[PDB]
């Protein structure tokens, strides 16, 4: 019996991670079949039993570059593959260059974690405007909230055409539920800082504050998975690696990073996933960023804005842990777990039905 | 001293006859340069013009996937780009070139500036790639020179801020302007000598999605018109594509009636369409061209990006069903009061490159 | 103005000079506009005013890497130069490989001088399965001859897609009739034109061809041979090596058009595995000696204009003889009030053939 | 009779101005024959320089720049049959063309050699060029007795360096020999260049608002600012300035326009070396837009200081000068010269032929 061919794209950790409950549902279920192409994860592809069927060699490198390649070679594998529907995550531009490679083949697309809006033009480059892209490529988009679907209907997106599925980090993060002895019976700060735009001085900043935290509080501690990237893994290793209140880690399996999670006291990130499962579990996040697509977590006071200011940074942390009143006032937003289900429903309604 | 250096980025004929206005304007004005770097009949529009191209990419060729013709803009853009030290890019229209050409700027951050922006159908992928094209250029540009307050509508309507729309009408009609003045270069021998003191119908049909049947259907229709009306002449300059020609030249050959042409020069065009009767055609340009002579226009097809001309009764859609383009014909040719009923500006003034510059002025040649 | 544009694709001399009289006609007619792409000749296109559009730098190597290359590239440089008809000729890889390409573009093809048959399959290779293959993929044939369409019947063609529009070699022979060594050595002397080129000869067959020229050349003392070889080493080796001796042979080097068909007039007649050569000495009413053991041009057997002789030196010597000896045999192989391949207005009746097909309406 | 083959290798506008005089020297010179590589036309016309060779290489990764420069220009210096190559400054075409040659046992010579900011790998990677080049090279021509110590630092042998001065001051004397005149004539007219990378941005916004704030403070005052050909530099001052009246934004200006332009200036703003060293020469106070520099001579001596980014100081340290007569007159101070008297194409000459025209 006929399966739709729903192919699955992703570079990078992140896409992979919200991708993988949906290529499960659509595992699970009868009516479709996932085919896996990537543009890169080894360690996320074993333990969500994601298998590729195609490995395009290409991200490594100028942006035209990497655009050019993805356009130029991604439609034969989609041919080779038989696919009916491309699904692509985010804001890559891997979702932008492969959506454009599925339109020229007159490949349908659908667009997991449709709508996030900062608000501020090519703010970040190129995020802002492959979201945008994206959204005119795409005919289908799965909306985490109410918000991002309003930002859809503003670019000109017809009502039925955008589903409300909340966000797939979510049924992730509930898939998955040395470091235990550094953790055990203390104050723990989880920080993962990534972003290019805070590499260099930013990022100094921050691991500053840090260190000034950590001498002032001597019972604090902080656990930071370092960025794959050297550049990133020097300013906090040159800033931090003396200090015994710091565990600097390697980039930890996301069960053992969401594990830490739910036994961090609070959240100090630029990561857009980690604002999304940090306030799930009831942690506060401080957001080492001038501004956020995920506004939700600001206005129901989940998260604040506290960018790369180490006094801000000191301040804001110490509120929280001193003050028991501001802390509770950041715990009681983007889904239920349930995404990947309310996305197949939306699959089958649109491409599995007949009037 | 430093001048703004335009880069103008186009691979076909219309691309180049409504950029071509904006080339002028920016090369007399001593605050801009403009930089011509093509894609790709082309030479013909280039001589008429004086457009000097400082670089030719030789990128698109007739059997290429959309893909590929794509990947090598998007690749390969970049490079000339920054070696003619370009400020802002201007892209026109719904070509895969302006969409390509708009990407590989932003991936340089250079400005984009959309030339005709905002045209709609209301036909999701209808036509493919076209209607796409325009969406993805529009999320692209910067600046966005809207021919008509309904096409600036669109593009709010999309999310684009008000004061990045400016409403500067079509340079297609600067551009007839400029042919109109200049019969040297538009007299055409053969064409007079067909055309003088005859009643001329002038039909143009191209695209990709009526090639066979349809096209047929239409080459049906003016066999019909001619047999039935010996003192009604066709002059139908082919698009140069073989499949194209063999369905016109298989049907209307032999018809004395019918002057069959390669295309034309712009000129040599704008001329014929003045001495027309009334068009038939597919083509955006021509919709837009025509009106302004005040002809009726026929439109070859079951949509238009162009509802001003419908909504003023300038133009009507007829599609390529052959019975509705007969009666449709006839009426006009027939009845003097339908004929007035389809003639009075729905598309700008003919100072459009003007308010063009003015617009690329105050964004990028300005300071607080 | 509207002109069809008719691709013309060749590689070789002998395709040039057949398709020149084509060329120059719908160059000269408004209506039509020919598009050259060679697959190699630069003394023909001078001779004839052909300006190649693109020249593929295919020719120099096995048939399959050829034809594969032929096949890979030519549809590029048609699809460019907006070609709507393309045209072949003759029989030879670049006819056929050319016409599947311009076939995969759905390019209409004809095909000049069709229908010739020798009767044995794949003999010769691979001229023989080309016309076959080519017949099929072509809309339109030239036939030089009644004979030649009745061919093209036999293989299922319709007979409203042949013409017999005659040969257009005739054409290109008579725009040459509008040398100080070759009359020097020709002036007042009894000359054999001799040509000898086809692969299946190369060796021993050539050595006994140049045998029967070197017994014939000692037996008549007066007789005297021009020998243009074919650019081919060991073409010109195996007559260097048996006759560069004889003051009575002159080998040459490839002559012009002009300066050949000048020769052909002057001699007494012509010894030739050549199919051009086969149709241009009839015409001029020489006597041809046919160095092969079949031909596709069977008319002037029939007629007696030409005789096959294949290689066997004992035969050519005794024909030449025949034919120098006795003049009742000699006018018995001159008609020069009959025509076999054509009047000479066959570009004209190819033209009128492309504007009845391409370019009318029902 | 035989010629010395000098191989001449650059890539920038930079290297060529400064490696002209020595091009012109070593043809006007029958010893000599100067063998031009480039590695990247107006420089080229207006010194008469004829490239034998032209390598497409820089447009683009360091490491594949380098690999392509290393792997490729072997063939070129081999096929001209080169006897000695001469490379230029900082620049990594300088430091790869010198590895390629070491590698075909041609023997380099260093023109522009010693200069030290003092601090490791800033700039990259124009610090650690220097220090390489200084490894491979044989022969090292010191523009000032300052670098001829820096090289010492460093291990050379001291009968490996000659204090040639520098040719920039040769090539500057080489081109004294209409809307910009217009603009300038009878007004104090400031001239300012700026392109360091590490400067593109917000940096340079500083250094626009600074302009902008001295422009309306002082409306009898005038600058002009030849722009560094790239896009982004281009906005960052077109996007300040374009508006004010006071300044002129120009298209990069060919060496003659530029030197005439920097001879009528009252003082000049920069974050060029080359400038750094032409604007002293011909009397004019530099501010150098860095907070560093690989020439402390001008710092010393007083023709130049340290004023960075900071639009504060910029005011300030340019309203200086332009009220105060005896500030300004303590940056032109007449006596010390710090880069060379501009016959420094020929020093270089005679070093060659003292090492590879002469036997014991
Ligand atoms: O050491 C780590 C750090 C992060 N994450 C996961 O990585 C994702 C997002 O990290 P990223 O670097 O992608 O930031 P983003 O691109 O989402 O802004 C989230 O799902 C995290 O739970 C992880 O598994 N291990
Ligand atoms: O033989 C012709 C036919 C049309 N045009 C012009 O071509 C443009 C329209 O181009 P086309 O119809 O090929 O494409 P479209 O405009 O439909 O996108 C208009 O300005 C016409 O006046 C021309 O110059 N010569
Ligand atoms: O030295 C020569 C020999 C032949 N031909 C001409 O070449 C053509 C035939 O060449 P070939 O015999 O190689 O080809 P074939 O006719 O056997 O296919 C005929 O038109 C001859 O008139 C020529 O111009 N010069
Ligand atoms: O518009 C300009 C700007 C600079 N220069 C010259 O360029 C050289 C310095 O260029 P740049 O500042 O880019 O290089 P740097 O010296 O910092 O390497 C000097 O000799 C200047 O005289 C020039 O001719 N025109
Ligand atoms: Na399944
Ligand atoms: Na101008
Ligand atoms: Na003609
Ligand atoms: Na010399």
Same mark, same amino acid.
């Given at each position: 019996?006929?399966?739709?061919?729903?192919?699955?794209? =992703?570079?990078?950790?992140? /896409?992979? *991670?919200?991708? +993988?409950? !949906?290529?499960?549902? &659509?595992?699970?279920?009868?009516? @479709? #079949?996932?085919?896996?192409?990537?543009?890169?994860?080894?360690?996320?592809?074993?333990?969500?039993?994601?298998?590729?069927?195609?490995?395009?060699?290409?991200?490594?490198?100028?942006?035209?570059?990497?655009?050019?390649?993805?356009?130029?070679?991604?439609?034969?594998?989609?041919?080779?593959?038989?696919?009916?529907?491309?699904?692509?995550?985010?804001?890559?531009?891997?979702?932008?260059?492969?959506? =454009?490679?599925?339109?020229? /083949?007159? *490949?349908?697309? +659908?667009? !997991?974690?449709?709508? &996030?809006?900062?608000?501020?033009? @090519? #703010?970040?480059?190129?995020?802002?405007?492959?979201?945008?892209?994206?959204?005119?490529?795409?005919?289908?988009?799965?909306?985490?909230?109410?918000?991002?679907?309003?930002?859809?209907?503003?670019?000109?997106?017809?009502?039925?055409?955008?589903?409300?599925?909340?966000?797939?980090?979510?049924?992730?993060?509930?898939?998955?539920?040395?470091?235990?002895?550094?953790?055990?019976?203390?104050?723990?700060?989880?920080?993962?800082?990534?972003?290019?735009?805070?590499?260099?001085?930013?990022?100094?900043?921050?691991?500053?504050?840090?260190?000034?935290?950590?001498?002032?509080?001597?019972?604090?501690?902080?656990?930071?998975?370092?960025?794959?990237?050297?550049?990133?893994?020097?300013?906090?290793?040159?800033?931090?690696?003396?200090?015994?209140?710091?565990?600097?880690?390697?980039?930890?399996?996301?069960?053992?990073?969401?594990?830490?999670?739910?036994?961090?006291?609070?959240?100090?990130?630029?990561?857009?996933?980690?604002?999304?499962?940090?306030?799930?579990?009831?942690?506060?996040?401080?957001?080492?960023?001038?501004?956020?697509?995920?506004?939700?977590?600001?206005?129901?006071?989940?998260?604040?804005?506290?960018?790369?200011?180490?006094?801000?940074?000191?301040?804001?942390?110490?509120?929280?842990?001193?003050?028991?009143?501001?802390?509770?006032?950041?715990?009681?937003?983007?889904?239920?777990?349930?995404?990947?289900?309310?996305?197949?429903?939306?699959?089958?309604?649109?491409?599995?039905?007949?009037?």
């Amino acid at each position: 019996h006929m399966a739709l061919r729903v192919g699955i794209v =992703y570079g990078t950790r992140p /896409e992979a *991670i919200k991708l +993988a409950p !949906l290529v499960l549902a &659509l595992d699970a279920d009868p009516g @479709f #079949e996932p085919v896996i192409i990537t543009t890169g994860l080894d360690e996320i592809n074993e333990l969500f039993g994601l298998r590729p069927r195609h490995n395009l060699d290409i991200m490594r490198q100028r942006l035209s570059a990497m655009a050019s390649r993805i356009v130029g070679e991604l439609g034969d594998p989609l041919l080779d593959e038989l696919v009916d529907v491309a699904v692509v995550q985010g804001d890559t531009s891997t979702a932008f260059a492969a959506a =454009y490679a599925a339109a020229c /083949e007159r *490949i349908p697309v +659908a667009h !997991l974690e449709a709508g &996030l809006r900062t608000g501020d033009r @090519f #703010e970040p480059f190129p995020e802002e405007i492959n979201r945008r892209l994206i959204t005119q490529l795409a005919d289908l988009h799965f909306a985490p909230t109410a918000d991002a679907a309003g930002n859809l209907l503003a670019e000109g997106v017809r009502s039925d055409d955008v589903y409300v599925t909340g966000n797939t980090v979510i049924d992730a993060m509930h898939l998955v539920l040395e470091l235990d002895a550094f953790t055990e019976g203390r104050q723990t700060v989880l920080l993962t800082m990534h972003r290019r735009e805070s590499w260099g001085i930013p990022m100094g900043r921050v691991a500053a504050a840090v260190a000034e935290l950590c001498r002032s509080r001597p019972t604090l501690r902080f656990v930071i998975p370092l960025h794959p990237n050297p550049e990133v893994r020097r300013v906090f290793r040159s800033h931090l690696s003396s200090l015994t209140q710091v565990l600097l880690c390697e980039p930890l399996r996301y069960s053992e990073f969401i594990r830490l999670m739910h036994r961090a006291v609070l959240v100090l990130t630029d990561s857009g996933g980690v604002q999304e499962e940090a306030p799930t579990l009831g942690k506060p996040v401080l957001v080492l960023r001038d501004r956020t697509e995920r506004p939700e977590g600001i206005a129901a006071g989940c998260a604040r804005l506290v960018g790369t200011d180490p006094a801000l940074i000191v301040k804001e942390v110490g509120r929280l842990l001193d003050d028991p009143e501001a802390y509770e006032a950041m715990r009681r937003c983007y889904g239920e777990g349930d995404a990947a289900a309310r996305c197949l429903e939306a699959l089958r309604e649109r491409w599995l039905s007949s009037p």
